[PDB]
Amino acid sequence: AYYLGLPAFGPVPLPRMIERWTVPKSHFIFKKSQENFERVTLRRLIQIKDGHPETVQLWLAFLQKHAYYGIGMKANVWEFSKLGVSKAMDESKSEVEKLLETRWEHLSHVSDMKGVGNFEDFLAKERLRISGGR
Amino acid sequence: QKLRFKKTKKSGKPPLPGERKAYRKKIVLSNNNALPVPGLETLRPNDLAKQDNVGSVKALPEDVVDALRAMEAFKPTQCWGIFRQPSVLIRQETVDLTKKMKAAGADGKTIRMVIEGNRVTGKSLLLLQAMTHAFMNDWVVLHIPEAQELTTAVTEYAPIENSPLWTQPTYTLK
Amino acid sequence: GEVLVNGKTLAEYFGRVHDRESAVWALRATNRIDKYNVWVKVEGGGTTGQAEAITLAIAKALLAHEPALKPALRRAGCVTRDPRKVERKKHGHVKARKMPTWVKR
Amino acid sequence: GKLAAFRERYGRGWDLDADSLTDLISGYATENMNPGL
Amino acid sequence: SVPRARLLQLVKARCELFSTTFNPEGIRTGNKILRQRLKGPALATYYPRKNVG
Amino acid sequence: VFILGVNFNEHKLVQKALESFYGLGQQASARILAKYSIHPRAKMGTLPPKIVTALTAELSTMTIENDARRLVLDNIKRLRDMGTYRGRRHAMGLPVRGQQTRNQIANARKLNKIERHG
Amino acid sequence: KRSVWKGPHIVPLPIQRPEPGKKIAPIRTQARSATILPNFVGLKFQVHNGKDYIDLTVTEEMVGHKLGEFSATRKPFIWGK
Amino acid sequence: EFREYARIAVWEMPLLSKYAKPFVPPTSEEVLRFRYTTYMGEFHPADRKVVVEFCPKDLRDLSEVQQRKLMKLAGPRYNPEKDIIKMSCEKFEHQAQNKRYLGDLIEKMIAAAKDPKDTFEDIPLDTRHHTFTKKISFPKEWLLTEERKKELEAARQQALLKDA
Amino acid sequence: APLIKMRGYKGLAGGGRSLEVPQPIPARQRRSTAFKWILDVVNKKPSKGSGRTMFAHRVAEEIVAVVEGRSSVWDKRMLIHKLGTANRANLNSPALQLKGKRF
Amino acid sequence: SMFRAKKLDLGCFTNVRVLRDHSKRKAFLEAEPERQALRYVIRNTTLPARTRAVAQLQLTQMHAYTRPTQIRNRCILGGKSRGILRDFKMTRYNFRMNALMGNIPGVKKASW
Amino acid sequence: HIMKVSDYRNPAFELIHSHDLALVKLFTDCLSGATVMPNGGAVLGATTRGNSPRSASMELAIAQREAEKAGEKEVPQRDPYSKKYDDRVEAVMKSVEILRLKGVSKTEARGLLEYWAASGMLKKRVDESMVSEKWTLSGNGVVGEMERASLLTMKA
RNA sequence: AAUAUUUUUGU
RNA sequence: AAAAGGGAUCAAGACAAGUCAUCAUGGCCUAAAUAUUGUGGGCUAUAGACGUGCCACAUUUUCCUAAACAAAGAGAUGCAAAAAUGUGAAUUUUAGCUAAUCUCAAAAAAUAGGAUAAAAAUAUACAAGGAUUGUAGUCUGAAAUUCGACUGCAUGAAUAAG
């Protein structure tokens, strides 16, 4: 974040989440003896301020490429915009069509792909299979 | 048929009606063991209005205690039975209130005041001082000790013919 | 000698005089209730848990002004931090230590 | 008064008069609805 | 101090704007079944499937 | 005094006296006193003789006696004649609301009868 | 269906009204939760009790109860012999 | 693995500055503040919600009454304390569809507030959905200033005479 | 408050009887047994009035009956003082000194 | 029986009731929208009395496997249905033995 | 208690308002100015915090009369969406004076503490340091709390 | 120092 | 600050201790049945008797009124604000939040007042208590009859501290 010019604030230690389970040590009648288990989730918070929207994405892109094993990440990105979002999102079609000129090579399919059928229904039910139910 | 063990089944004069209620509502205004405060001055017809007495304790007249007791001015929650002679501190608010009552009755005016405040800060006893300045100056005092006895439905009530009002005969008699 | 515990007075916050005396005990043992104004801000716990907590707070803050009072606050009991804490419940027990009924037969 | 109670609760539609009872119950009923009686 | 009939005019302006059901009488329209999100696919993917052995 | 042929003592609240009948509870009694402007804390010795007569004539137009027990006893007899599961349990003096019968069925055996106490 | 606002529980039954004078056999059913509607007040039922089919003659008094309320599943507990 | 990261922090990180851009404060037209949540390579059902929050006073096309009518139509979406209309949308399968909805929905809230048919001026602003918080502060009369030191030295001397 | 306490040794007084031997008790144990006697009498009295001062005025009336020597707890005090006086010789009984000495 | 796939598709601990509960989860996945419509028509008091009585009779003819209340989580290592932890899909015992060995990520013996 | 709906019931089983009671309807009029006392006098009504219901109409009027006297252009107003008010209570408390009683001054506390000591009920040296202590434990001089900490204590 | 109630059975 | 406290851990061996009904496994058995599928029923039966629990038998209790103080945990298999409706269970409709942000959510005892007493045994003053049952409803769910959890009205058992 320093090289990208983003002023970061943290790491802020958030309250650790503790899930507890008490199971019997035996698989049978012996219930007068049980033991406690837990799963503590240690977390941190790095908040960035006064950062360019695009430069914030290069930062999040850099952390995902070189992510450390055993860590989860969730980022909330904020951005200001003008009124009339419908017009803006349509005018920005040609701009995104150029940046994708060299990236369309990733996908390839036989002419008139028939296995997809209803395009919108495919993504909906395929996104569930990828996420396992939801 | 059942065969378990079952316990086998196996003193003083009771109090009169109203005896118990009269025990938690009795007011004790003296204590023989307490010492007689030397220098304790009694009140005068114009003693609760002087501002020079602010911060001094003065005893209630012997005859006013019978009038304050006739209309239940005192209350059990108040600690009167710890001393010998019932006395009240002349508060700064007593002079302000009593100075307005003295000017109201003087020129036939009327003051309509609501004494509001926090808890035991002493609203109730401020009326006792107002009623005290009334008796000593030959006023007509009409006091309702508890306003919850008129609304909690604990006394007889009857309607009036051709009107939305309701009378309380048993209370108006007492 | 004004004291405001969480914005309210000492009487409007603690309805029990035993707690009022214990909150400002530090200023009472040293006979300085009439020379310092306290503005406390408590959070968590109960009545006694908060009353005694203010005792160690005013004591420590009082020492910042007059550090020579520690020998007195020592004997008054306003310098020690009571570490007593509710014991956790343990499996096989009804409470921290209460055990269920034991049947010999 | 069980009949009157039924009419007030579930209306006179199911009540026998002179009409969901006529066709819905017997209509959905078919042969071999449940093997083994 | 605001008439109820005059309040429903504002409650109705929100329904036309946010596209919500306007039911001032509380009629049982069975809409609680429509808002409930399906949980079928979440339960079906409980037992893992046969994979490479 | 007297109310519907039942005698009550002076030192007895009217609220509690009207509740001594089969069928009258907190709702009915509360509305019968308001109808004649009797504060809940009224005792029998304070009721005038004319208002006592109004209460008697007031309860005579309600189901405040065996007329009520009849409805309850008729509902139990109908369950027995129809041959329902709930009817047998009344006759057999057994719990009628699906309760474990391995233990603690004393109050059922004592009160469950085709002719209830009320 | 307990809540009254959504009608009673109805199950498909072969309650076909015969012509006057015809012989109709009783209806053998295992739907012990079928509300006794007024439409078949007078028909002969044979409700399943788990092992046997107990005869039943629906009358105007049973309208509202379930069919399983007239065929006990367990046998009365009797001590001794 | 530490060396792999130290090799990246010494040779690859400095190259991030060649493609960085400076932050510019939003102009007067930037009235909306959208939020997009990412899970960094994970598929989570909550990564489709888009939260937007704007200030009624930022819309300089509405009058005083048209701005207040906008607060009444917002309903529980308006925060009287912060004066911010916050509203999210997760009705659609894609974030792009949830942003377009809030973009069109805000144009209806403004177009409806500009409707002179009913101004709802008789309806007082309802804020029962919000729970206002009371914050206490240190009394400014207790600050030991040069003037309070003199007020205390007097009160401390007046107490010595009453006893003496 | 009693000045002594009776502690018995199981089955040393004869055929299964305990050998009650007096022993002194400190102040705290003296004031505890005393006040607990006063409460045993207060809990057996009948109710008299109403209000919050019900239980407080019953205990206060027993403290007056104590100082005035017209209470029942005095008889409970002399009843335990006589046991010590009667059993004052058991301190040197032939049982507490010959428990298991002679094999 | 008609819902039991002719080719086993389970990779976990297979059982008589494990295969029986997996066949119920797939039958309900295909009939949830259709079953949610009957439940919506039965509660809509605005529809005709006949439409609600029809939708009420069709919901009774649905196969038991289609009912969602039949689904009961089971252990993917032992096939049991009693004492199953949703967060792990195993009995309380299997969770213990795997938690101590370190097979369940993040779990830890609690002591405090 | 008289600024709410009484607990009484009319023949139609409807709660009677406290102001409809003949006895309460008299004091209310003398307090509102309707019934004019020709010979003058005073009409004082003291609230209570022990066993007292809450009436927003009374607690609001008290806040309006105190704010007006304090010279403030802005005065507390009703809650436009609350249904806990009563128009009758507002008209009665429209032109009444409010006397707010707070803790006694430090000089009045002493005069009351010296009276308790002279009676033997307070065995303490009553000086400025001792009057400022009871003035704190009693919430800035609450007379009722000052008695709980010096008379109804378990130290004497 | 000279104290002493009774207390069976186990394929 | 301090004389600190608690949790986990707690050996070998014996009890041929418990588990071939988690799993796993040797021998021995069933293989048109000791395997497999569905509907309904049962596991909820009840003479006597035994275990743990809840609650009550009023005076340090319960009841009524009010402007105090917690911690921890839960919500992608969902926790549900506000409002409106109903005496109530609850319904209608979804704001926000997938969370130190939003929501469940409100602590209660307590503190301070107030009500009721021949507060059960002298029957015209039968206390507290809430089991049993009748009836009208609501919620989940194909489905509440055997056999669910709550709500209103009525009914009003034993129970003197064992």
Ligand SMILES: Nc1ncnc2c1ncn2[C@@H]1O[C@H](COP(=O)(O)OP(=O)(O)OP(=O)(O)O)[C@@H](O)[C@H]1O
């Ligand atoms: N002016 C006074 N002089 C002497 N004693 C006083 C005075 N004011 C109050 N007290 C004492 O303080 C205690 C509380 O007084 P009081 O009962 O009048 O308070 P209150 O404001 O009426 O309380 P509440 O609002 O709860 O009804 C009493 O014991 C009283 O004797």
Ligand SMILES: [K+]
């Ligand atoms: K969509």
Ligand SMILES: [K+]
């Ligand atoms: K061992």
Ligand SMILES: [K+]
């Ligand atoms: K009773």
Ligand SMILES: [Mg+2]
């Ligand atoms: Mg008062």
Ligand SMILES: [Mg+2]
């Ligand atoms: Mg505890």
Ligand SMILES: [Mg+2]
């Ligand atoms: Mg038992």
Ligand SMILES: [Mg+2]
């Ligand atoms: Mg109390």
Ligand SMILES: [Mg+2]
């Ligand atoms: Mg042998």
Ligand SMILES: [Mg+2]
């Ligand atoms: Mg063995």
Ligand SMILES: [Mg+2]
């Ligand atoms: Mg065995």
Ligand SMILES: [Mg+2]
């Ligand atoms: Mg096996």
Ligand SMILES: [Mg+2]
């Ligand atoms: Mg069982």
Ligand SMILES: [Mg+2]
């Ligand atoms: Mg109770």
Ligand SMILES: [Mg+2]
């Ligand atoms: Mg709500």
Ligand SMILES: [Mg+2]
């Ligand atoms: Mg909860």
